[model samples]
Target: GSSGSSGAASLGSQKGGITKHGWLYKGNMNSAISVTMRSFKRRFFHLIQLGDGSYNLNFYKDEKISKEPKGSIFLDSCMGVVQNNKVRRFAFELKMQDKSSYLLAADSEVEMEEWITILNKILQLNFEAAMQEKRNGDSHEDDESGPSSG
Candidate 1:
């Protein structure tokens, strides 16, 4: 849960300790997700059932603001859960590890300009909400935490 000045939020190991292998860059999901979906549809979809068990999916979008080239951002609501009987017992294996260490989501070179257009209206509304009155605690907390996919 470390916050970076670069705005590249990340989840997993921050100390580079014994469990350092679990680290993953938070905002990089678009590339991994896109690749996974393509490969899975073309290759692995048949092997696994899409809605056979406890399966679900979700999508979220946000404005791209930052010095780095803003691109389409993606979020996977179907977060990875630690399999109860993984080979290593308690190893921290990512859900995408079985498929070349990538996840199913957006991988295209997302255009920030278009994304910003979507956000401009929303940001304006939000600004007006806060400007007219003090923000609630939850809203302030959300601001403190920055943004999240889950």
Candidate 2:
């Protein structure tokens, strides 16, 4: 049962800026799309199983998709991740912007109250300022001016 379908599934497609729901916007920089485990399978999600139930997902950067880049990182709450589960498989989809993207993953599972704390910790410690040096209007892979991945 650990294995399931792969690839992302969109909840609904856009039609003339209209969707199944009146307002198609998911959320903002300060909020996340919440879903109880009892109903995870009902919605579409990208699963990135890191290991031991600790996995990450590529979520549509609601803020990034909704607004211009402000050099800020967006973090979403882990949907079905848990210590007992330890992601064996997961998936998600994020809109590509200016060839800039973020890697969202959980280092470990904590209580609901600790979710925010863990998110902040990851941003503070794990995420590096790798995007800061990128000059605007320069998204080509061989621009020949930037920092190394290391």
Candidate 3:
């Protein structure tokens, strides 16, 4: 009993690498004159992947251990990720179908590309899962239909 329970616990506790969260600027681009000037506010959020192939953006009050998640955004609601290199080399926009939009940035171009790559992977995985479900449903319908249907 102990061995089985421990195996399940370990499986459930797995997490992705540290690139899931970082400091990003959120707001209009024209407001900030420079990096030092007051323009976009900084926010730290954690992008946690769920077992069901979805993601959650857990926002913290402050970047500290004691800080709990003030709010969260489910990636299932996200429409797509828009890459915006025109404004800044290290910037991307996350657009939700019904929810509000989010602007995120990285310290460098490489890091931004990493974020974009990971996000695209997540979307692809979710899309594949959805397609598989649809195919399974079609197969089930075929199974229900007798030899006369064919």
Best by TM-score: 3
lDDT of 1 by residue, 67-111 (tens): 222221111222243221122222122233224222221122132
**Global fold similarity of model 1 (TM-score):** 0.18
Every model's TM-score: 0.18, 0.19, 0.59
Candidate 1, superposed: residue stretches over 4 Å from native? 1-112, 133-150
List clashing residue pairs in candidate 3: none
User: What is each predicted model's overall lDDT from 0 to 1?
Assistant: 0.24, 0.26, 0.57
Off by over 4 Å in 2: 1-110, 126-150
Clash counts per candidate, in order, are 5, 10, 0
Which runs in model 3 stand beyond 4 Å of their true positions? 1-19, 28-38, 51-53, 65-67, 132-150
Tens-place lDDT digits, model 3, residues 68-116 = 5766665666666778665566788777666466666677876677767
Tens digits of per-residue lDDT for model 2, 47-112: 222221122332332323322322332322322212222111221222223333322222233322
Please report the candidate that would top lDDT against the real structure: 3
Candidates ranked, most accurate by lDDT first: 3, 2, 1
